[PDB]
Amino acid sequence: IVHVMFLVDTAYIYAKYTTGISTDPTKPMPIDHNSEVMACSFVNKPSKQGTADLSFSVPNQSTVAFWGSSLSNNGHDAIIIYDIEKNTNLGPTDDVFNPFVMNQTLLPGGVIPSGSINGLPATTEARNIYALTSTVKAKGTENFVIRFGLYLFDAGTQTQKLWSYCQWDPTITVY
Amino acid sequence: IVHVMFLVDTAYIYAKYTTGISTDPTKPMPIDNSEVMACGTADLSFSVPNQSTVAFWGSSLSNNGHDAIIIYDIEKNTNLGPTDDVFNPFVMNQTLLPGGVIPSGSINGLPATTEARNIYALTSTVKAKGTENFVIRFGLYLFDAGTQTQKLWSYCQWDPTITVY
Numbered sequence A: 001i002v003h004v005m006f007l008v009d010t011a012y013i014y015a016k017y018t019t020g021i022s023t024d025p026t027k028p029m030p031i032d033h034n035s036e037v038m039a040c041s042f043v044n045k046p047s048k049q050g051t052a053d054l055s056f057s058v059p060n061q062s063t064v065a066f067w068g069s070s071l072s073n074n075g076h077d078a079i080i081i082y083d084i085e086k087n088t089n090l091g092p093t094d095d096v097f098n099p100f101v102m103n104q105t106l107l108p109g110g111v112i113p114s115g116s117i118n119g120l121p122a123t124t125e126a127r128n129i130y131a132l133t134s135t136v137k138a139k140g141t142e143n144f145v146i147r148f149g150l151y152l153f154d155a156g157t158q159t160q161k162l163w164s165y166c167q168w169d170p171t172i173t174v175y
Numbered sequence B: 001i002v003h004v005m006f007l008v009d010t011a012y013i014y015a016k017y018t019t020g021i022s023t024d025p026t027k028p029m030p031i032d033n034s035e036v037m038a039c040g041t042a043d044l045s046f047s048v049p050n051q052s053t054v055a056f057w058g059s060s061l062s063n064n065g066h067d068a069i070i071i072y073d074i075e076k077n078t079n080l081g082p083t084d085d086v087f088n089p090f091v092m093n094q095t096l097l098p099g100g101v102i103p104s105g106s107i108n109g110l111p112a113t114t115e116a117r118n119i120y121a122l123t124s125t126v127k128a129k130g131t132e133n134f135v136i137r138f139g140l141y142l143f144d145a146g147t148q149t150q151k152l153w154s155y156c157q158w159d160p161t162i163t164v165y
């Protein structure tokens, strides 16, 4: 099971994009490649050889899970991915992944810090978790579209509020 | 507020470290590649006014949904000689987030719901510009498919260097 951290620099995006802000998720605001990083484990043999924003090697049919997060681990600003699909606007590309799905599950025993000065020992408690998941169909290079909501912390309400739905067009390679 | 993601490749660590596993948090296992910070040889370097707040958020590559990590110590590392006093002491900072967003139960998760949740970060404030050697200790919890729960595998220690300029 290959996990991919999808990190977003919300502060940068809020600084740069002052127009074209969208709260219609079918018409998200396009953003450049400077504020997002996708990270996976070394055991999945990542490769900085190539032009792809992410590259790794795992057997066909392995499960892949994408976890979106702001730089505050969704504790201050936050992001939630709502779409991951093949991008056809850049010409033919490979069918590397099966359709992604929003996958919500119960984690019966998730650990959190306890109320001690250093947080130890951890307590375990149930919690819902979510990831966008798929499976590797075949080796190849696939252009993608990734859309997510960008939620900014509002100090007034102490709540995270939608600022804009956004879209990034990475390329991913399974070799 | 400067936020720093502290990411840990729990799968790599579990593959590479086969001895020296410790469940004594006062004698954690040292690690070299598998930890990164995202915001000289400084593992992290950034520039913000003195007295700004800094918040460190620890996470596995599954956002603590499969394996998980929890930082329990961030302190000045004195085993490599004198180093600068760049940060004030860190504290474990737990707060209530009245309105955290989560996906709703729709097919694509939209629109998001809001719900209360406890968050935590290790926080501090910049005392001065400089380069400080640090020690960072954390618990590494692995997902046990048998119980569907995350269980302590080892307490671990990484020794980064951070520069505020």
Ligand SMILES: OC[C@H]1O[C@@H](O)[C@H](O)[C@@H](O)[C@@H]1O
Binding pocket: A010, A011, A014, A076, A077, A152, A153, A154, A155
């Ligand atoms: O308007 C409020 C927002 O300001 C931005 O500069 C920050 O990146 C956000 O975290 C904050 O919630």
Ligand SMILES: OC[C@H]1O[C@@H](O)[C@H](O)[C@@H](O)[C@@H]1O
Binding pocket: B010, B011, B014, B066, B067, B142, B143, B144, B145
């Ligand atoms: O299989 C034992 C452990 O292997 C590691 O590679 C995984 O990251 C853990 O989730 C798992 O519990």
